[PDB]
DNA sequence: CTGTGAGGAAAGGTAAACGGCTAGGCTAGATTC
DNA sequence: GAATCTAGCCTAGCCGTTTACCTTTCCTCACAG
């Protein structure tokens, strides 16, 4: 994507790895123009080990966006395969009442498994709460 | 004068003025013999029959032990009522022996439908009829001599069967079918006179000519076809099959003339494709339907909604004029007082005899809704079939008895009655439920499932007749018999299975479960016959195994699928690069013939103008609903 | 070194719905001898 | 009058094809015994 407002243009630096887990970026602002990728790479300790999306790279936003970001969201990905099908669903619950999701690089346009659609949707506005483990 | 005897005003008005004295004379004797007032009123079209029945009745019962009052009244009210009975009192004894073993019902039917002349004609020439060179079974003789105009078809058959069967060349059953209708002598003579001319100049096959001449009113469709085929095929741009279909019904001459007169007017002023006109004019009373459509299309399409497609749908059945007039008369009162949508009324009226169904619905909606507790949707579903009036009248009478004396829910009764011929199914269930439940060990649910289909009465009778023999001598569980008998045409499937199981299981190496799977669908008899005919051809000429043939045939319309596979395997495998497994996969679902034709028609386009490989279109077509996806999801959106 | 949770998508599978044909009966009016 | 020929209108039974509503799979960028 190349469209967004606020004190920043719309582009991300890419890291070609092909190995490892994932590299991602984020662009969020609450009251200042401060923003960074927040060194999000893969899954670590999260208070939701039961939801598979909680260890995927996109789903990690829930933590620190439910806490801080009622605003929209911007992401870019370094895995050129496509957005997992587990996060096409299952992602809408784990945000506040309204938020936005963004696009993946054009390289990840060769999906082989179920789901995995390119140029992911905005992923706006579901109303239920993430469920407590156990 | 007849009021003292106890006749109502309407009954007195029905009787002709000059025959009331005869009723006042022979009323006491008839009442003593056990006749009702309605029977006496009906037995007055023939005044001379009253004295014959009153004086000679014990002899009638002695000669015809099983005869009832209704049969005697029906026989003795026609144009030859007295003389037919007086000949039945003298020929019945000789007609019951050889060569024709005739029962009471056949004698009564032949008398009532043919008269004294037919009775004596059958009595005289029985030896010549049953013997060489004719060799006619008694059933064929009864069928021929049971029409108004008999004693003339028999002599014509005797004189013309060898000539027609030797020179022109026709199967004797074809001649019998031609001669088994009113005015069959004229039909036979006209066929003999006009068959070569129609088969040589106009290029018609003999089967079509026989089909035209196998209807009451022949000798008029053949000459009209001969006169009007070229002008219809040239000026109006039609096809010979359409003309044959138009002329292959009762009064086809009138239909042909009306089509010639009114095709341009309907195709220009109103707006209607010629196919719709042909569909309208392809039923009995076609000219009436055409003229009524021309008269009533604008008013119904403007003042009552009712798009022209619905009007054409209504008018495309036998008696389509009465249905249109009844719809025009009863749409407002039915949609304004009983709370019914116009689509429901159209669905009710789009069947044979829809006027009676509409009248019965108007008469019986409130009583059924407020005395038995039925939703209007249930009544509409009951009344939306052929003969729905009888179904409604039978439900109104037999609902409480079946719901109390047999422990059946109203939903089951509604499901039984919501089918063609549902009047007979309810009576058969009432008669045969205890016997089937006690003497054979069947639950009521199985009986209801057997009876909840078209022709369920025959299915129940066949199940009762054939359950022990199939269960004991062939090693079949009762569940398999129920599964076979559940579908439409269960009697035919059961008979075909009983006839064809051993040779299929022995000469072809098929297991009984495969036969059960083949015969457990609509039209399973045709599938069984086609499999028996085509298994060795498909397994040797082409590379196939019996499992693939069984999979193809284990579906609705398996005969068509098998024939289409046989026709289209080399064409698809030698021009489009498809392996036989893929062709089998395409054809192993419902509507497989259409799927194969669509794939053949649409593969080049989807391969040269959309960027799709063959395996992808095969995968789309391999699932149920292949024509819809290939024809309107991948070929119209782009 | 091979087998585990939440959440709406597509996809097999049986039944219900929607068309069209064939065989047989009964009544009223017209036509021929 | 005595027999026979023509048109319409109603009930049952059988054979093919398309559509609406349930239920059994498939999906990782994680990890444990
Ligand atoms: Zn994911």
mmCIF file with all atom_site columns, C-alpha atoms in Angstrom, chain A:
data_model
loop_
_atom_site.group_PDB
_atom_site.id
_atom_site.type_symbol
_atom_site.label_atom_id
_atom_site.label_alt_id
_atom_site.label_comp_id
_atom_site.label_asym_id
_atom_site.label_entity_id
_atom_site.label_seq_id
_atom_site.pdbx_PDB_ins_code
_atom_site.Cartn_x
_atom_site.Cartn_y
_atom_site.Cartn_z
_atom_site.occupancy
_atom_site.B_iso_or_equiv
_atom_site.pdbx_formal_charge
_atom_site.auth_seq_id
_atom_site.auth_comp_id
_atom_site.auth_asym_id
_atom_site.auth_atom_id
_atom_site.pdbx_PDB_model_num
ATOM 1   C CA . UNK A 1 1   ? 0.000   0.000   0.000  1.00 0.00 ? 1   UNK A CA 1
ATOM 2   C CA . UNK A 1 2   ? 0.982   3.620   -0.596 1.00 0.00 ? 2   UNK A CA 1
ATOM 3   C CA . UNK A 1 3   ? -1.841  5.598   1.056  1.00 0.00 ? 3   UNK A CA 1
ATOM 4   C CA . UNK A 1 4   ? -2.017  6.872   4.655  1.00 0.00 ? 4   UNK A CA 1
ATOM 5   C CA . UNK A 1 5   ? -2.166  10.161  6.568  1.00 0.00 ? 5   UNK A CA 1
ATOM 6   C CA . UNK A 1 6   ? -0.247  11.459  9.563  1.00 0.00 ? 6   UNK A CA 1
ATOM 7   C CA . UNK A 1 7   ? 3.380   12.563  9.777  1.00 0.00 ? 7   UNK A CA 1
ATOM 8   C CA . UNK A 1 8   ? 4.694   9.689   7.650  1.00 0.00 ? 8   UNK A CA 1
ATOM 9   C CA . UNK A 1 9   ? 4.585   8.511   4.047  1.00 0.00 ? 9   UNK A CA 1
ATOM 10  C CA . UNK A 1 10  ? 3.555   4.978   3.094  1.00 0.00 ? 10  UNK A CA 1
ATOM 11  C CA . UNK A 1 11  ? 6.392   2.510   2.474  1.00 0.00 ? 11  UNK A CA 1
ATOM 12  C CA . UNK A 1 12  ? 8.451   -0.021  4.395  1.00 0.00 ? 12  UNK A CA 1
ATOM 13  C CA . UNK A 1 13  ? 11.990  -1.388  4.095  1.00 0.00 ? 13  UNK A CA 1
ATOM 14  C CA . UNK A 1 14  ? 12.122  -5.051  3.111  1.00 0.00 ? 14  UNK A CA 1
ATOM 15  C CA . UNK A 1 15  ? 14.412  -7.758  4.495  1.00 0.00 ? 15  UNK A CA 1
ATOM 16  C CA . UNK A 1 16  ? 14.817  -10.806 2.200  1.00 0.00 ? 16  UNK A CA 1
ATOM 17  C CA . UNK A 1 17  ? 15.449  -13.844 4.403  1.00 0.00 ? 17  UNK A CA 1
ATOM 18  C CA . UNK A 1 18  ? 13.525  -16.871 2.999  1.00 0.00 ? 18  UNK A CA 1
ATOM 19  C CA . UNK A 1 19  ? 14.562  -18.562 6.256  1.00 0.00 ? 19  UNK A CA 1
ATOM 20  C CA . UNK A 1 20  ? 13.698  -17.994 9.883  1.00 0.00 ? 20  UNK A CA 1
ATOM 21  C CA . UNK A 1 21  ? 10.112  -17.178 10.837 1.00 0.00 ? 21  UNK A CA 1
ATOM 22  C CA . UNK A 1 22  ? 8.986   -13.694 9.659  1.00 0.00 ? 22  UNK A CA 1
ATOM 23  C CA . UNK A 1 23  ? 9.884   -9.999  9.697  1.00 0.00 ? 23  UNK A CA 1
ATOM 24  C CA . UNK A 1 24  ? 7.196   -7.337  10.001 1.00 0.00 ? 24  UNK A CA 1
ATOM 25  C CA . UNK A 1 25  ? 6.592   -3.644  10.575 1.00 0.00 ? 25  UNK A CA 1
ATOM 26  C CA . UNK A 1 26  ? 3.942   -1.469  12.205 1.00 0.00 ? 26  UNK A CA 1
ATOM 27  C CA . UNK A 1 27  ? 2.880   2.164   11.910 1.00 0.00 ? 27  UNK A CA 1
ATOM 28  C CA . UNK A 1 28  ? 0.624   3.426   14.708 1.00 0.00 ? 28  UNK A CA 1
ATOM 29  C CA . UNK A 1 29  ? 0.024   6.819   16.313 1.00 0.00 ? 29  UNK A CA 1
ATOM 30  C CA . UNK A 1 30  ? -2.100  7.632   19.371 1.00 0.00 ? 30  UNK A CA 1
ATOM 31  C CA . UNK A 1 31  ? -1.368  11.313  20.057 1.00 0.00 ? 31  UNK A CA 1
ATOM 32  C CA . UNK A 1 32  ? 2.210   11.861  18.822 1.00 0.00 ? 32  UNK A CA 1
ATOM 33  C CA . UNK A 1 33  ? 3.729   11.031  15.459 1.00 0.00 ? 33  UNK A CA 1
ATOM 34  C CA . UNK A 1 34  ? 5.847   8.316   17.046 1.00 0.00 ? 34  UNK A CA 1
ATOM 35  C CA . UNK A 1 35  ? 5.897   4.915   15.361 1.00 0.00 ? 35  UNK A CA 1
ATOM 36  C CA . UNK A 1 36  ? 8.261   2.067   14.504 1.00 0.00 ? 36  UNK A CA 1
ATOM 37  C CA . UNK A 1 37  ? 8.259   -1.586  13.463 1.00 0.00 ? 37  UNK A CA 1
ATOM 38  C CA . UNK A 1 38  ? 8.590   -2.491  17.175 1.00 0.00 ? 38  UNK A CA 1
ATOM 39  C CA . UNK A 1 39  ? 11.031  -5.322  16.292 1.00 0.00 ? 39  UNK A CA 1
ATOM 40  C CA . UNK A 1 40  ? 8.166   -7.753  15.644 1.00 0.00 ? 40  UNK A CA 1
ATOM 41  C CA . UNK A 1 41  ? 9.600   -10.947 14.136 1.00 0.00 ? 41  UNK A CA 1
ATOM 42  C CA . UNK A 1 42  ? 7.813   -14.052 15.428 1.00 0.00 ? 42  UNK A CA 1
ATOM 43  C CA . UNK A 1 43  ? 5.912   -15.428 18.413 1.00 0.00 ? 43  UNK A CA 1
ATOM 44  C CA . UNK A 1 44  ? 7.145   -15.477 21.980 1.00 0.00 ? 44  UNK A CA 1
ATOM 45  C CA . UNK A 1 45  ? 5.334   -15.385 25.328 1.00 0.00 ? 45  UNK A CA 1
ATOM 46  C CA . UNK A 1 46  ? 1.770   -14.122 24.927 1.00 0.00 ? 46  UNK A CA 1
ATOM 47  C CA . UNK A 1 47  ? -1.220  -14.487 27.270 1.00 0.00 ? 47  UNK A CA 1
ATOM 48  C CA . UNK A 1 48  ? -3.090  -16.470 24.592 1.00 0.00 ? 48  UNK A CA 1
ATOM 49  C CA . UNK A 1 49  ? -1.202  -19.664 23.651 1.00 0.00 ? 49  UNK A CA 1
ATOM 50  C CA . UNK A 1 50  ? -4.440  -21.380 22.607 1.00 0.00 ? 50  UNK A CA 1
ATOM 51  C CA . UNK A 1 51  ? -5.236  -19.109 19.639 1.00 0.00 ? 51  UNK A CA 1
ATOM 52  C CA . UNK A 1 52  ? -3.028  -19.903 16.649 1.00 0.00 ? 52  UNK A CA 1
ATOM 53  C CA . UNK A 1 53  ? -3.290  -16.315 15.428 1.00 0.00 ? 53  UNK A CA 1
ATOM 54  C CA . UNK A 1 54  ? -1.718  -15.096 18.674 1.00 0.00 ? 54  UNK A CA 1
ATOM 55  C CA . UNK A 1 55  ? 1.669   -16.392 17.543 1.00 0.00 ? 55  UNK A CA 1
ATOM 56  C CA . UNK A 1 56  ? 1.407   -15.314 13.948 1.00 0.00 ? 56  UNK A CA 1
ATOM 57  C CA . UNK A 1 57  ? 3.073   -12.002 13.066 1.00 0.00 ? 57  UNK A CA 1
ATOM 58  C CA . UNK A 1 58  ? -0.054  -10.023 12.155 1.00 0.00 ? 58  UNK A CA 1
ATOM 59  C CA . UNK A 1 59  ? -2.059  -11.132 15.196 1.00 0.00 ? 59  UNK A CA 1
ATOM 60  C CA . UNK A 1 60  ? 0.552   -9.808  17.624 1.00 0.00 ? 60  UNK A CA 1
ATOM 61  C CA . UNK A 1 61  ? -0.972  -6.336  17.205 1.00 0.00 ? 61  UNK A CA 1
ATOM 62  C CA . UNK A 1 62  ? -3.798  -7.243  19.617 1.00 0.00 ? 62  UNK A CA 1
ATOM 63  C CA . UNK A 1 63  ? -1.264  -6.941  22.409 1.00 0.00 ? 63  UNK A CA 1
ATOM 64  C CA . UNK A 1 64  ? -0.476  -3.197  22.721 1.00 0.00 ? 64  UNK A CA 1
ATOM 65  C CA . UNK A 1 65  ? -3.336  -2.208  20.402 1.00 0.00 ? 65  UNK A CA 1
ATOM 66  C CA . UNK A 1 66  ? -6.137  -3.310  22.716 1.00 0.00 ? 66  UNK A CA 1
ATOM 67  C CA . UNK A 1 67  ? -3.994  -1.730  25.432 1.00 0.00 ? 67  UNK A CA 1
ATOM 68  C CA . UNK A 1 68  ? -3.109  1.415   23.466 1.00 0.00 ? 68  UNK A CA 1
ATOM 69  C CA . UNK A 1 69  ? -4.311  1.555   19.881 1.00 0.00 ? 69  UNK A CA 1
ATOM 70  C CA . UNK A 1 70  ? -7.962  2.355   19.323 1.00 0.00 ? 70  UNK A CA 1
ATOM 71  C CA . UNK A 1 71  ? -6.679  3.813   16.042 1.00 0.00 ? 71  UNK A CA 1
ATOM 72  C CA . UNK A 1 72  ? -6.109  2.014   12.741 1.00 0.00 ? 72  UNK A CA 1
ATOM 73  C CA . UNK A 1 73  ? -3.103  -0.147  11.890 1.00 0.00 ? 73  UNK A CA 1
ATOM 74  C CA . UNK A 1 74  ? -0.433  -0.451  9.217  1.00 0.00 ? 74  UNK A CA 1
ATOM 75  C CA . UNK A 1 75  ? 1.693   -3.548  8.586  1.00 0.00 ? 75  UNK A CA 1
ATOM 76  C CA . UNK A 1 76  ? 4.089   -4.929  6.002  1.00 0.00 ? 76  UNK A CA 1
ATOM 77  C CA . UNK A 1 77  ? 5.444   -8.448  5.787  1.00 0.00 ? 77  UNK A CA 1
ATOM 78  C CA . UNK A 1 78  ? 8.736   -10.074 4.828  1.00 0.00 ? 78  UNK A CA 1
ATOM 79  C CA . UNK A 1 79  ? 7.303   -13.537 4.125  1.00 0.00 ? 79  UNK A CA 1
ATOM 80  C CA . UNK A 1 80  ? 6.476   -13.607 0.373  1.00 0.00 ? 80  UNK A CA 1
ATOM 81  C CA . UNK A 1 81  ? 3.956   -16.449 0.506  1.00 0.00 ? 81  UNK A CA 1
ATOM 82  C CA . UNK A 1 82  ? 0.792   -14.792 1.797  1.00 0.00 ? 82  UNK A CA 1
ATOM 83  C CA . UNK A 1 83  ? -1.420  -14.283 4.826  1.00 0.00 ? 83  UNK A CA 1
ATOM 84  C CA . UNK A 1 84  ? -2.143  -17.571 6.606  1.00 0.00 ? 84  UNK A CA 1
ATOM 85  C CA . UNK A 1 85  ? -5.714  -18.744 6.308  1.00 0.00 ? 85  UNK A CA 1
ATOM 86  C CA . UNK A 1 86  ? -5.974  -19.091 10.055 1.00 0.00 ? 86  UNK A CA 1
ATOM 87  C CA . UNK A 1 87  ? -5.805  -15.354 10.394 1.00 0.00 ? 87  UNK A CA 1
ATOM 88  C CA . UNK A 1 88  ? -8.388  -14.589 7.699  1.00 0.00 ? 88  UNK A CA 1
ATOM 89  C CA . UNK A 1 89  ? -10.909 -15.564 10.346 1.00 0.00 ? 89  UNK A CA 1
ATOM 90  C CA . UNK A 1 90  ? -10.098 -15.658 14.074 1.00 0.00 ? 90  UNK A CA 1
ATOM 91  C CA . UNK A 1 91  ? -8.488  -12.217 13.839 1.00 0.00 ? 91  UNK A CA 1
ATOM 92  C CA . UNK A 1 92  ? -11.625 -10.100 14.051 1.00 0.00 ? 92  UNK A CA 1
ATOM 93  C CA . UNK A 1 93  ? -12.325 -10.953 17.698 1.00 0.00 ? 93  UNK A CA 1
ATOM 94  C CA . UNK A 1 94  ? -8.913  -9.903  19.028 1.00 0.00 ? 94  UNK A CA 1
ATOM 95  C CA . UNK A 1 95  ? -9.102  -6.144  18.497 1.00 0.00 ? 95  UNK A CA 1
ATOM 96  C CA . UNK A 1 96  ? -11.084 -3.237  19.993 1.00 0.00 ? 96  UNK A CA 1
ATOM 97  C CA . UNK A 1 97  ? -14.419 -2.154  18.524 1.00 0.00 ? 97  UNK A CA 1
ATOM 98  C CA . UNK A 1 98  ? -12.717 -0.635  15.456 1.00 0.00 ? 98  UNK A CA 1
ATOM 99  C CA . UNK A 1 99  ? -9.289  -1.015  13.842 1.00 0.00 ? 99  UNK A CA 1
ATOM 100 C CA . UNK A 1 100 ? -7.724  -1.485  10.414 1.00 0.00 ? 100 UNK A CA 1
ATOM 101 C CA . UNK A 1 101 ? -5.359  -3.943  8.735  1.00 0.00 ? 101 UNK A CA 1
ATOM 102 C CA . UNK A 1 102 ? -3.126  -3.427  5.694  1.00 0.00 ? 102 UNK A CA 1
ATOM 103 C CA . UNK A 1 103 ? -1.419  -4.999  2.696  1.00 0.00 ? 103 UNK A CA 1
ATOM 104 C CA . UNK A 1 104 ? 1.339   -7.564  2.066  1.00 0.00 ? 104 UNK A CA 1
ATOM 105 C CA . UNK A 1 105 ? 4.107   -7.259  -0.583 1.00 0.00 ? 105 UNK A CA 1
ATOM 106 C CA . UNK A 1 106 ? 3.210   -8.277  -4.150 1.00 0.00 ? 106 UNK A CA 1
ATOM 107 C CA . UNK A 1 107 ? 5.691   -11.171 -4.100 1.00 0.00 ? 107 UNK A CA 1
ATOM 108 C CA . UNK A 1 108 ? 3.402   -13.223 -1.860 1.00 0.00 ? 108 UNK A CA 1
ATOM 109 C CA . UNK A 1 109 ? 0.900   -13.798 -4.673 1.00 0.00 ? 109 UNK A CA 1
ATOM 110 C CA . UNK A 1 110 ? 1.525   -17.525 -5.221 1.00 0.00 ? 110 UNK A CA 1
ATOM 111 C CA . UNK A 1 111 ? -0.624  -19.326 -2.619 1.00 0.00 ? 111 UNK A CA 1
ATOM 112 C CA . UNK A 1 112 ? -0.694  -23.113 -2.592 1.00 0.00 ? 112 UNK A CA 1
ATOM 113 C CA . UNK A 1 113 ? -2.694  -23.829 0.588  1.00 0.00 ? 113 UNK A CA 1
ATOM 114 C CA . UNK A 1 114 ? -6.306  -22.990 1.415  1.00 0.00 ? 114 UNK A CA 1
ATOM 115 C CA . UNK A 1 115 ? -7.097  -19.332 1.936  1.00 0.00 ? 115 UNK A CA 1
ATOM 116 C CA . UNK A 1 116 ? -4.067  -17.058 1.551  1.00 0.00 ? 116 UNK A CA 1
ATOM 117 C CA . UNK A 1 117 ? -5.548  -14.133 -0.349 1.00 0.00 ? 117 UNK A CA 1
ATOM 118 C CA . UNK A 1 118 ? -3.317  -11.247 -1.373 1.00 0.00 ? 118 UNK A CA 1
ATOM 119 C CA . UNK A 1 119 ? -3.729  -7.555  -0.578 1.00 0.00 ? 119 UNK A CA 1
ATOM 120 C CA . UNK A 1 120 ? -5.421  -8.388  2.708  1.00 0.00 ? 120 UNK A CA 1
ATOM 121 C CA . UNK A 1 121 ? -8.614  -6.581  3.671  1.00 0.00 ? 121 UNK A CA 1
ATOM 122 C CA . UNK A 1 122 ? -8.899  -3.766  6.197  1.00 0.00 ? 122 UNK A CA 1
ATOM 123 C CA . UNK A 1 123 ? -10.231 -6.216  8.839  1.00 0.00 ? 123 UNK A CA 1
ATOM 124 C CA . UNK A 1 124 ? -12.606 -3.746  10.477 1.00 0.00 ? 124 UNK A CA 1
ATOM 125 C CA . UNK A 1 125 ? -14.769 -3.836  13.550 1.00 0.00 ? 125 UNK A CA 1
ATOM 126 C CA . UNK A 1 126 ? -15.802 -7.035  15.272 1.00 0.00 ? 126 UNK A CA 1
ATOM 127 C CA . UNK A 1 127 ? -17.283 -6.694  18.736 1.00 0.00 ? 127 UNK A CA 1
ATOM 128 C CA . UNK A 1 128 ? -16.522 -9.806  20.800 1.00 0.00 ? 128 UNK A CA 1
ATOM 129 C CA . UNK A 1 129 ? -13.686 -10.251 23.414 1.00 0.00 ? 129 UNK A CA 1
ATOM 130 C CA . UNK A 1 130 ? -10.683 -12.579 23.231 1.00 0.00 ? 130 UNK A CA 1
ATOM 131 C CA . UNK A 1 131 ? -11.308 -15.648 25.358 1.00 0.00 ? 131 UNK A CA 1
ATOM 132 C CA . UNK A 1 132 ? -9.326  -16.480 28.468 1.00 0.00 ? 132 UNK A CA 1
ATOM 133 C CA . UNK A 1 133 ? -7.175  -19.625 28.273 1.00 0.00 ? 133 UNK A CA 1
ATOM 134 C CA . UNK A 1 134 ? -8.195  -22.711 30.234 1.00 0.00 ? 134 UNK A CA 1
#
